[PDB]
Amino acid sequence: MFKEIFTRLIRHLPSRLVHRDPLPGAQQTVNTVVPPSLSAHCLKMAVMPEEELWKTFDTHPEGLNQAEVESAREQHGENKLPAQQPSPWWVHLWVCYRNPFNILLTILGAISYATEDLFAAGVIALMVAISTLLNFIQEARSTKAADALKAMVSNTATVLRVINDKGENGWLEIPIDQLVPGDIIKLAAGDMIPADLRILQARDLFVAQASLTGESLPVEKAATTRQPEHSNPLECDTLCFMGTTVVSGTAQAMVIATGANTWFGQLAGRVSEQESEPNAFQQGISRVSMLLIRFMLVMAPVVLLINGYTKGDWWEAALFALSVAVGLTPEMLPMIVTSTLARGAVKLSKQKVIVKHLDAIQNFGAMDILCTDKTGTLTQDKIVLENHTDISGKTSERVLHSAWLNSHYQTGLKNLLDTAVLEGTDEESARSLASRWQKIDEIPFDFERRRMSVVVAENTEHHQLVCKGALQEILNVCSQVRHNGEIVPLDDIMLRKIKRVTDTLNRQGLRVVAVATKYLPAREGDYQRADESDLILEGYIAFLDPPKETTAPALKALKASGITVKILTGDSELVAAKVCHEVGLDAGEVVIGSDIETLSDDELANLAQRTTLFARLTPMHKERIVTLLKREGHVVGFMGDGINDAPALRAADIGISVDGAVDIAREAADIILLEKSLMVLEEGVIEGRRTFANMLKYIKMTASSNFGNVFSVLVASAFLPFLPMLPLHLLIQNLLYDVSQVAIPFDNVDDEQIQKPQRWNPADLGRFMIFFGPISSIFDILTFCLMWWVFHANTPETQTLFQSGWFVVGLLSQTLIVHMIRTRRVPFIQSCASWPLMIMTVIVMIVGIALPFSPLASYLQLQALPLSYFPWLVAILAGYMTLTQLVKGFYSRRYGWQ
Amino acid sequence: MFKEIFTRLIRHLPSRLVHRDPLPGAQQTVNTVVPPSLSAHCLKMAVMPEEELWKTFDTHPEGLNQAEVESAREQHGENKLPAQQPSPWWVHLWVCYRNPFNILLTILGAISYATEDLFAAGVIALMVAISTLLNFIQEARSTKAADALKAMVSNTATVLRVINDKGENGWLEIPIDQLVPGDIIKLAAGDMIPADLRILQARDLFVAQASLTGESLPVEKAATTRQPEHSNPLECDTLCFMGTTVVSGTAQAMVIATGANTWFGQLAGRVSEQESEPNAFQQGISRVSMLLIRFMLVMAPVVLLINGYTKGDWWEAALFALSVAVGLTPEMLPMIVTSTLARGAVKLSKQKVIVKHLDAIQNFGAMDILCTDKTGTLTQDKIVLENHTDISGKTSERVLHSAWLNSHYQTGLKNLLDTAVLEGTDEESARSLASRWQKIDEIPFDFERRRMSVVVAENTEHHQLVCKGALQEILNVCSQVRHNGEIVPLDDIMLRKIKRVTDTLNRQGLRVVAVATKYLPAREGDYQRADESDLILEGYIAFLDPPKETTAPALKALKASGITVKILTGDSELVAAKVCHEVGLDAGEVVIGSDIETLSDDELANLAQRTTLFARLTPMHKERIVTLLKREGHVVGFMGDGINDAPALRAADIGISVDGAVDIAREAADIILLEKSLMVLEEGVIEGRRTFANMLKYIKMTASSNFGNVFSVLVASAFLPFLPMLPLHLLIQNLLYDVSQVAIPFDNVDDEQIQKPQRWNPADLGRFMIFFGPISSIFDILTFCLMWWVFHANTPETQTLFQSGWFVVGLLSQTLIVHMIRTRRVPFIQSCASWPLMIMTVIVMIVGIALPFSPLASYLQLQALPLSYFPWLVAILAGYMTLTQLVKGFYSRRYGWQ
Ligand SMILES: Nc1ncnc2c1ncn2[C@@H]1O[C@H](COP(=O)(O)OP(=O)(O)OP(=O)(O)O)[C@@H](O)[C@H]1O
Ligand SMILES: Nc1ncnc2c1ncn2[C@@H]1O[C@H](COP(=O)(O)OP(=O)(O)OP(=O)(O)O)[C@@H](O)[C@H]1O
Ligand SMILES: [Mg+2]
Ligand SMILES: [Mg+2]
Ligand SMILES: [Mg+2]
Ligand SMILES: [Mg+2]
Ligand SMILES: [Mg+2]
Ligand SMILES: [Mg+2]
Ligand SMILES: [Mg+2]
Ligand SMILES: [Mg+2]
């Protein structure tokens, strides 16, 4: 325990490949007051006139040429966090070369084989150099390939710039990282704010400043200040901050700060600390490395003492001990992780399952609860039927026109209703209505009201207040009904008639949306929420969106694989239960969102496991239920692409999203699907499990044989009067084994280890490496005895034959046990291996067997081999390969292979 | 030269692999003289009592043991046409060995090389044997693989038999070719009759005998005859014949005749005559062979005369002539065709595009018009909404039960409406209705009436006549309307109201189905079509089946590839036009099927090219329009799976069907999709186009080089005083080239030759072989000159050096030209080749190079080679390989590569 050196002998993968990005835009709204310097700077930056910003920076409303932009970027920096910047390649090569084991091995080789055998020191240096070069090349290629997927789904911003020749403007799109202070961008509806901005012109813009303050309701933004005093940096009504979204309207602005110099960085303390959080993966890797280093430190010094006490060459004994123990170095773990996860990431990218950071694969194949939504996931989102009826039940042709205006003079996100309404009316009426009315104002949508209104006028006499929304949210405010072509007061029986007729319209999959209007005199101020009072109800619009064809087979496959699907919707409870019944899902009993509001954590944690359907949920309920569903040991995934599902994605253990959605919903995600569906997800889960199934095998088959070799050396070398194998032979054996192992990430996995949500136990290695280690030791000692007695050996004068024989038999045994302990079934007749692995094994086997009979054998302190040794070698190899097949039965009976 | 009959040097592929099965069940009802013996036997069969058929055969109503069935099958035969039986493998080996070219070559080798060297004759025999053995193995393996896909979609039949051999009945399903005479089978609705039957018990069975008589109406089938006199073999009312389906009811019969001893065999004359029909493929395969044989007889005798006049060994000259000319043999075509089509068929089988006979691939990648049907191809075929309303527009709750009774007492094919109605009622009401009523009779469905009726009684006092069908086909009969709870007479305005309300229900995608009942007193006879008079209308049912999600991308992909899609529906003309608009397909103007009935052939031919939609079509219109769309030369495909689209699938140039359909629809089809969709078809069309490209390449890149070698020999053998290459070397060259070419049907085809509905022209082989042939003769004569002058040769005592050099350079030039005349782009940087082809090329190259420097070289009359010809070999090879790249430009600009 403790041993601060043990934390320095373990290298770490970069924090961009294994850790979730710490900056979603908001993260945690800490109570850090921060020095008043930044607040004063922001307040100063929010008061200068338009002309001052012209000269403070080099901004020009015609674009920035390709020369000034580079100079300004180099002067200031880049729009990236400090932790997201890759390291230089030469530093990467250097850090992979100063490993303590490698440096000690080189120093000890220089000490021992110098005064008489300088060539041995040279070849030792060559071997360590080639090993570290192989590791560096593999890791560098994998980490370069893994960063191409991160930039393929990056957010974009619309800058003006210059594109073609000169002053051509262009309004081209660039990634948010290629941003420079003093640059002008344009904001539209549903768009993340890249960095701190300064609005120049406005068109009734609204932003959701809830990620920083918690006001929930959107806050209006304008170019020239309208409030008398700001007194705060977050309410200046003139700037913008990253992490927020644009809810309504369009505007233009110019950036004033980028990188870590903005808000949410040093102001929120995101860079300061907040990094001492290992996310499971970083704990398992550390535990595995600690186990390996503990076993190495246990094994090495006993062998050192034995070889230093039997003979008198202490330096040689220490070097031999280090050479034997080098096979269990923790330095191999980064290669094992990166070179295997990168290939899985590329294969997933081939199936439109783009993965942002490599760690997501571990949680993507180990989950057992999927929390999705209704629209898009189950339904087509394209409606094929709609009836713009009236209050009595007749086609009106007035409700449709009163709903066209509300869906043509609004700048919010378009729905599945607005497109249908725009495509429903004929061209002539649309043109006439467009020519007859002019937009005046707009009240944007916000939750807890569920209602959107727009104010339109025809002439300079009066104004209209057309309105839509859910049926209950207009029926709760309206006061009159236009019945039989005349305005009549709304009494109580008419309220009990609509709630029956429209409830009958439900239970069939039809959604109901009401429409209300109001005549209002000529005003000059700005409207607000409270203006929507005492309107006249006109009618409703009932429409149907059918279920997607590829829904039932996806659910059957997900149930077969062990994943349980739960629906967290925010629609009505009568609908979303018929939809769940048309696709075969067992809705059972539903739970509304009002009951959850008065339940304790213990009650909810046990209620939420037998529901399968929650209706009428606010986002807070979603975020609470997602958190509570992870109670016992489960892994919970949330799939959603709305504008308000920012905390839910981070709260769950995975953040599955969809490409082509709101920017904030993609900035907080982990896996970005390229096509919203459920069959793609199902086919990607299988590959996610399969890729991670190779890593465990690649670790186990490498650790077990090395431990067996170390144990054999410890047991046998005591009686032997000389070193069984010279260290150079061990080094070249390890190098050849590492070369042969490269083809493992391209293996075949049986269809029995993946049809279950798999859980990773790092302590299984310490048992699998003890049960499968001495099996090689028995045959190694048998080969020692056979070469000693049959072939007239154990002569201090002549010993190269013994070392050559053990080298050959050891390489054969090490390389040929891979094909037998990779499966639970009988090999080569039920579960074979992939062709590249066989090809690499054969090539390495030929190279190893042909090395002693080569001109270079004498240079490497090795000699030839008699032709009578081959049958005994084959017999020993076949016996060792056969024995493990019979032994394998007892291991799984104890705790389980996987 | 003609002499088509004299040309018996053309072996033919079996008729079961390239020709459509001549027995679709009815074929053509030609007026052939009926054999009196067969008619007498048929009339005699259907008069015996129940007990006589017990002893006429060995049938027992408990099954047939696994011994009696085998003996009876061996005594009578098998339920298969004589043309669909495989040949013994030893006969296959023999027919591949008696090839006239091979026999003449062997005889001439025996004549020439026997009095001075028997070893030469021995090795000649060995070479020809190994060649014919390779061809036999390839063809046999491919034709064995190809017949596994033909029995995977074979029609089944429910026989009783014994499963445990101790007595358990079983009712197991077997293919219709394992049927033994004297066996009992059970018939259900929608089941083609396997063979001639004998009905034992009946449950109001109906069979559509419209494939042998043309009545077009179902004919009732009984168990004990009720008609007084038969007087005809096709109206006995007790027997069944193959080719006819079961429309309604269930029954149990016993087979009497199987195989070619049935009706439709010697009666319809299917086996006798009507065999001389080449289906395009059999014409191109003949013309290509004719061209090859014409060139061979043009080239051989001139070379024979030259080598017999220059030298004096006439036998050697003739043997050399045949050895040079053996490359252009027509015997290699069957291997080229089968071994390349079988792999494509297997790959299609891997994508659920199962192909019945191998010729369908040629017409599956060359079609430019696709004719399909609305339901199932565009809609999901399951309804998500339905309204069992009343005449005035209210939920009647009475029209539903009057529909449940009809949908619960029918025996015909189930529809999308019946499943919903059976699922659209609560369990209690269903149980009450089932326990209250009883079934009496049933009038089946038939076209030209478009309705179904069932007679149901509750107490023995009266009955009911609940009827279903189209709105116009029921409103044309009914006389009263149950309105406001009282039966009111129907008048004219009530007819102009329904046809407006229900036409407003259309234009939205809703289908309308009416319901009518009638109160009828107690009867004892059988009802007919005319009893449906003066019914009381109750209401209609409007439902909606939504479009399938994967429809628009499929249509976009099909339009990209050039496959124009046309709709031939049999539904209303108001619906099926909104459905086409929802999926994005253009409709324009709609053509009703009544207008087509009064149009000539030319007007219909020039009209059906710009319609894209046909509404309200009877099957005769479907067949006529399908026939008349092949006017210009286009290829027309029909997709359909109904009970009446039997002649349409055969009239079209390709019978695309769907697995799981009616048996008659599958028995008259070429491709059986395993999943109804428009994306599986699209992904299979590309593979179909791609396999034919590989076939064309494999044909083209073989004959041109051989013609080049023949021309080179003809040019250069005059002045040369001895044979440039001994015949054994040429034979081994051809053998090694064939071994290298084995891997061609695994190649990569560029995505430029398959983006158009390609079509085949056999005359292009007589041009590509003349343009690219002599391009190898210049380098061949240059190599001759270089070896003669630079290497001090053409001494009539030492000549093996010349033969060795030319053999090596010729093998190199033949094998290395493949990789550049296989694409139009620049090779190895824009379009590479598949790895197996490269591996085979490398292996063959190594074997060819190492052969002269081998101990066996002296046995084959071939010596070593000095280490100075290698640079000249490499230089000339590179020059020849790089000249054709520049030459390739002028070829495509003349008539086109493909
Ligand atoms: N632009 C909008 N933003 C938010 N809510 C909207 C908007 N337009 C309509 N609504 C209504 O507000 C409620 C919020 O539904 P929302 O789209 O957030 O649901 P969800 O959680 O994504 O799931 P699903 O829509 O599949 O049931 C619904 O009643 C919806 O009809
Ligand atoms: N069992 C039935 N057999 C045949 N036609 C039926 C049957 N039941 C109802 N019909 C009606 O008879 C007509 C024949 O339609 P059919 O199923 O043959 O069309 P189709 O050519 O396959 O094309 P579509 O996709 O429009 O259905 C339709 O009006 C259909 O509603
Ligand atoms: Mg406003
Ligand atoms: Mg949503
Ligand atoms: Mg965006
Ligand atoms: Mg070992
Ligand atoms: Mg009847
Ligand atoms: Mg049909
Ligand atoms: Mg069948
Ligand atoms: Mg040649």
Q: Report the residue of B378, B383, B549, B839 to disrupt the A interface, i.e. the one with the largest count of A CBs within 10 Å.
A: B549
Q: Which residue of B has its CA nearest to A583?
A: B384
Query: What is the enclosing helix (H) or strand (E) of B385?
Result: strand B385-387
Strands B564-568 and B369-372, how do they pair? parallel
- For the domain made up of B354-380+548-673, give the CATH fold: Rossmann fold (3.40.50)
In degrees and rounded to multiples of 5, residue A738 shows phi and psi of -65, -40
Q: Which of B509, B548, B549 is nearest residue A385 as measured by Cβ atoms?
A: B509
Residues with a beta carbon under 5 angstroms from ion ligand 4: A 373, 642
Q: Residues with beta carbon inside 6 Å of ligand 1?
A: A 373-375, 412-413, 415, 445, 450, 470, 569-571, 642
Residues of chain B contacting A, Cβ within 8 Å: 380, 384-385, 508-509, 544, 546-550, 582
- Between CA B51 and CA A32 the distance in angstroms is 103
Structure determination technique employed = cryo-EM
Could you tell me how far CA A806 lies from the centroid of its own chain?
Answer: 47
User: Which CATH number does the domain A23-78+154-274 belong to among 3.30.1370.10, 1.10.1040.50, 3.40.50.300, 2.70.150.10?
Assistant: 2.70.150.10
Question: Which residues of chain B are in CATH 3.40.1110.10 domains?
Answer: 385-544
Ligand 1, residue A374: give the atom nearest the CA.
Answer: 26
Q: Are A385 and B549 inside 8 Å of each other by CB?
A: no
Closest CA in chain A for residue B393: A393
Q: Is there a binding annotation on residue B196?
A: no
Give the nearest partner residue to A546 out of B508, B546, B550, using CB atoms: B546
Chain mean position to CA B393: 50
Name the residue of A248, A375, A580 to mutate for ligand 1: max ligand atoms within 8 A of Cβ. A375
Residues followed by a break in chain B, C–N over 2.5 Å? none
Residues A427 and A416: their CA atoms lie apart, in Å, by 20
Place of tokens 């200040």: A225
What's the start-to-end Cα distance of chain A, in Å?
Answer: 29
CB atoms within 10 A of CB A508: 15
CATH superfamily, region B300-348+684-891: Calcium-transporting ATPase, transmembrane domain (1.20.1110.10)
Q: Please state the φ and ψ torsions of residue B206, each to the nearest 5 degrees.
A: -140, 135
* Angle of helix B314-325 versus helix B727-741 axis, rounded to 10: 10
Task: Give B510 to chain A, closest Cα distance, Å.
Answer: 9
Q: Is B313 annotated as a binding residue?
A: no
B572 alpha carbon, closest ligand: 2
Query: Is B545 annotated among the ligand-binding residues?
Result: no
Put simply, the answer to whether A550 touches B547 (Cβ < 8 Å) is no
Q: Which of B191, B204, B359, B373 is catalytic?
A: B373
Per residue in B779-810, is it b (16+ CB within 10 Å) or e — as a string?
Answer: bbeebbebbeeeeebbeeeebbbbbbbbbbbb
CATH 1.20.1110.10 occupies which residues in chain A? 282-339+684-892
Tokens of A703: 């650790």
Minimal C-alpha gap between A717 and chain B (Å): 48
Distance from residue B488's CA to the centre of ligand 5 (Å): 65
Kindly tell me the number of DSSP H helices and DSSP E strands found in chain A: 29, 26
| A641 labelled ligand-binding | yes
Residue in chain B lying closest to A506 (CA): B385
Alpha-carbon distance values, B334 to A148, A492, B291, B699, B840 (Å): 50, 87, 16, 11, 22
Residues of A serving a catalytic function are 373
Residue nearest to atom 16 of ligand 1 (CA): A570
What letter represents residue A828's amino acid?
F
Residue B313 vs residues B225, B318, B643, B730: alpha-carbon distances, Å? 85, 9, 72, 19
Q: At what angle do helices A118-146 and A100-112 cross, to 10 degrees?
A: 170
Output b/e per residue, A467-484; b: 16+ Cβ within 10 A.
bbbbbebbbebbeebbbe
Q: Where in chain B is the domain with CATH 2.70.150.10?
A: 23-86+152-261
Ligand 9 centroid to B50 CA: how many Å? Answer: 28
Q: Strands across the sheet with B671-673, in order?
A: B591-592, B613-615, B564-568, B369-372, B636-639, B654-658, B671-673
CB contact under 8 A, B544 and A548: no
Cα of A173 to ligand 5 centre, how many Å?
Answer: 10
Test A549 with B380 for CB contact under 8 angstroms.
yes
* Nearest chain A alpha carbon to B546: A546
DSSP for B298-355?
A: HHHHHHHHHHHHHSS-HHHHHHHHHHHHGGG-GGGHHHHHHHHHHHHHHHHHTTT--B
The protein residue with its alpha carbon nearest to ligand 1, atom 15, reads A570
Q: Do B544 and A508 touch (CB under 8 A)?
A: no
What are the structure tokens assigned to A680, written together? 């793609």
**What gap in Å lies between CA A582 and CA B727, rounded to an integer?**
75
Torsion, Cα B582 B583 B587 B593, to 10 degrees, reads -90
Residue B55: other Cβ atoms inside 10 A: 9
Mention the CATH class of domain A360-380+548-673: alpha beta
Q: Please report which residue ranges of A193-313 form alpha helices under DSSP H.
A: 281-310
Residue A754: which residues within 8 A CB-CB, separation 6 or more? A365, A686, A689, A690, A693
- Regarding the beta carbon of B373 and ligand 2, being less than 6 Å apart is answered yes
CA of B546 to the centre of ligand 9 (A): 28
Contact B379, B546 (CB under 8 A): yes
How far is A691 from A671, CA to CA, in rounded Å?
A: 16
For residue B470, the ligand 2 atom closest to its alpha carbon is: 29
Output the CATH code of domain B23-86+152-261.
2.70.150.10
Distance from CA of B383 to the nearest CA of A (A): 10
Q: With residue B780 as reference, give the H or E element that holds it.
A: helix B777-790
Q: B134-153 burial, b if ≥16 CB within 10 A, otherwise e?
A: ebbebbeebbebbbebbeeb
CATH of domain A282-339+684-892: 1.20.1110.10
Which two structure tokens, joined as six digits, stand for B192? 């083609």
- Give how far Cα A139 sits from Cα of A14, A145, A146, A338, A747, Å: 11, 10, 10, 6, 19
Going by CA atoms, what residue is nearest to atom 18 of ligand 1? A570
β-partners of residue A613 are A567
The span from the CA of A19 to the CA of A356, in Å, is 11
> Residue A279, annotated ligand binder?
no
* CATH top-level class of A385-544: alpha beta
- Which of A382, A384, A501, A503 should we substitute to test contact with B (largest number of B Cβ atoms within 10 Å)? A384
Closest C-alpha residue for ligand 1 atom 11? A450
For residue B213, report the phi and psi dihedrals to the nearest 5 degrees.
-125, -30
Nearest alpha-carbon partner for B300 in B320, B279, B284: B320
Resolution (A): 3.7
Q: Which of A206, A379, A407, A445 has most ligand 1 atoms within 8 Å of its beta carbon, as the pocket-test mutant?
A: A445
Question: Which residue from B minimizes the CA distance to A677?
Answer: B549
- Pairing of the two strands B654-658 and B636-639: parallel
Residue B575 has phi, psi (to 5 degrees) of -75, 170
Q: Which residues, in sequence order, are bridge partners of residue B672?
A: B657
Q: Three-state SS for A672?
A: strand
Written in H, E and C, the secondary structure of B847-879 is HHHHCCCCHHHCCCCCCCCCCCCHHHHHHHHHH
Tokens of A678: 């459920």
Kindly list the residues from chain A whose CB atom is less than 8 angstroms away from the CB atom of residue B385: 385, 508-510, 544
Q: Name the closest-CA residue to atom 14, ligand 1.
A: A570
Q: Using an 8 Å CB-CB cutoff, list residues of chain A that contact chain B.
A: 380, 384-385, 508-510, 544, 546-550, 582
